[PDB]
Design a protein around this ligand. Structure first.
Ligand code: NA
Length: 130
């Protein structure tokens, strides 16, 4: 499913992402935007290390979900990577919450540093009523 901007914003709020571990909703929106373009079925194979990024937040199979084909991988979210490709983003959110409970927080995603950190991210949630 390709979410509309404000549709996703309101969905994330309902799922308790606003301010989760100090991360504002606009930051999560900035992250989803750059990681997948708000697309839940987005996948990206990293030929360099044999891992794959899954879903709206592009969560990596090496540590977060299990896809069976990633060498020496772990499954911290305790989910099949397929759960991160559903239209219902509940599981992806629960896993994103797990990721940020690690010390790096939102910084775990390199894209967030590149496109969101120290930027005016208000644009991602404006007019959405959140
Ligand atoms: Na994993």
């Amino acid at each position: 499913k390709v979410f509309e901007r404000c549709e996703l914003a309101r969905t994330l709020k309902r799922l308790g992402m606003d301010g989760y571990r100090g991360i504002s909703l606009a930051n999560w929106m900035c992250l989803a935007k750059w990681e997948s373009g708000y697309n839940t079925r987005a996948t990206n194979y990293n030929a360099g290390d044999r891992s794959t990024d899954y879903g709206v937040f592009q969560i990596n199979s090496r540590y977060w979900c299990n896809d069976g084909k990633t060498p020496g991988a772990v499954n911290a979210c305790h989910l099949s990577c397929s759960a991160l490709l559903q239209d219902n983003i509940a599981d992806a959110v629960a896993c994103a919450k797990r990721v940020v409970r690690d010390p790096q927080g939102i910084r775990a995603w390199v894209a967030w540093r590149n496109r969101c950190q120290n930027r005016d991210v208000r644009q991602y949630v404006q007019g959405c009523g959140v």
